[model samples]
Target: AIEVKLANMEAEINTLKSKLELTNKLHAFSMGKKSGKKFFVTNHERMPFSKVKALCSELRGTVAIPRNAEENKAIQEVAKTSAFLGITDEVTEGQFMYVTGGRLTYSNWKKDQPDDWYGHGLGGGEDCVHIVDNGLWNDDSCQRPYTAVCEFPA
Candidate 1:
């Protein structure tokens, strides 16, 4: 009885080893050079400073002017503040942020714009913030609220 049990255990171990080897071979073959299976990893999203500045300028604000770095610093400060007040939400693979408590406040008017948008842009309908190519942001809807990362002081 002891010999029989040992034989069974050895047989099971051999079977498991065979299965594992077969699986490994199958995996290698499936993922071979011609398999077209490539592993990909994404990095952190980065927004272009130039595009960010362009957006800030579009928000009815003065562009900081300086022959030195002071202007850049001031712009950065404003950008940080705007980002703080801005509300950002992720839609699809991109992000959307919008201004709040303004005449053009965010609203879903259930209009044709949303239908036209059809979830193509980041934001559509009455109000939406669209993150365009790269980290650039824009207002996708004509009558919709402006959901840019930059907001002007009232």
Candidate 2:
């Protein structure tokens, strides 16, 4: 009957939905997404800090911000090189803050970071933060290009 045909269609749609979900999971995994409360992703492109933040927002995620040692490592693994963290001192020089708006509760600043280095022109100060060796942080000019990472809640 017509009811039987409708039931079949619903079953097919449900199966397809689940399949798509699984496919997304696998794709994320292949692209270096770790399963957790939050995960990070990158297009592996080099761009200035502002551009990076814009791109991540375009993807509906915030710029990557590693809040602790483990998160720092996860971001490092996905980034594979020095990358711009969502942390910056742009709002208040020498006062590092997360893009999500708060002071850091944990930090791994490479000794003497946020030095407000007077190079690179355009105000010639280090306002942005990025990961260096072993996920240590450093302050840098915001105009300098770096890899972009985005964080998503799962």
Candidate 3:
């Protein structure tokens, strides 16, 4: 009788594990997981850099940071417009760093960017990074509103 009770407990534990796995799968599916290669998601909301970061964090994700060309295309294809990236030069001007931490390893900059051009005189030049329409990176003001894209683990 004791053996039967122990076996039932194991069976229940196994069932719960399978249930949890299924829930994760469904959540990923709803987010439109990109062929199991990447996990960028957006609700088409436009917001400032910090707001985007906070919103994504609350969604259990982080602002999208394209590590390579393919990933960059993924963001563009979905957002279809300039979206704030998980990078900034706020910590040390001119040296862009991922909001997650550390300096950026890959970049696809436009002809002229990160110029720190304080021409607009909006208190100062920009430090936040966002992808322009042509799928190239450019620095923009942090206070500016743009599309928000966040990514989850795939």
Candidate 4:
């Protein structure tokens, strides 16, 4: 009887291990490769920055944060449209920071970018960074809805 119980436990453990492997494989299918790194992009559904971040986190990934020019270009090629990255300046105005907790060392901003522009009779409040049509960075409002990209390890 004890031998039979041990065999059953072993079978259950093997089943769990197989399930874990299958989950990882499925996740890999959802990701795209860029500059040798893995990432995922959401549909053109606009959402607040915080909400986008939360959704990415739920998927076991973080908002996409390009580390260099090549990576940025790769991300742009994959995006093929304007979208939100993981960088922001919400913590300190005019001081942009990546969601990965790093300073904004590499930048690909368009001319006169990070203007944090405000309209007449409207207060200036741009604090989030996003990729424009030409794949250049621009500072925009955090409350504004936009598609988001998430990054993950290969």
Best by lDDT, which number?
3
Q: Taking the tens digit of each residue's C-alpha lDDT, what string does model 4 give over 1-154? A: 9999999999999999999998877756755544445666665567878987998899888987877877687667666676788998878888888887869888999999888877522356788888887678888877777776777785
Instruction: Give me the overall lDDT of model 2.
Output: 0.88
lDDT of 1 by residue, 26-130 (tens): 754553312432211111223433344355566453222211233223333333321111322323223333322223233222233223343535344323333
How far off is residue 41 in model 1, in Å? Answer: 12
The residue ranges of model 3 lying beyond 4 angstroms of the native Cα positions read 1-17
Q: Tens-digit lDDT track for model 3 on 82-153?
A: 899999999888999999999788999999787887775666789998999789998988888889999898
The best candidate by TM-score is: 3
Instruction: Give the number of colliding residue pairs in candidate 1.
Output: 3
Q: List the residue pairs that clash in candidate 2.
A: none
For candidate 1, the lDDT comes to 0.36
Error of 1 at 96 (Å): 47
Candidate order, TM-score descending = 3, 4, 2, 1
The TM-score, computed over Cα atoms with residue i paired to residue i, of candidate 3 is 0.85
Q: Cα miss at 87, model 1 (Å)?
A: 46
Q: Using Cα atoms with residue i matched to residue i, what is each candidate's TM-score against the true structure?
A: 0.22, 0.81, 0.85, 0.82
Evaluated at residue 38, the lDDT of candidate 3 is: 64
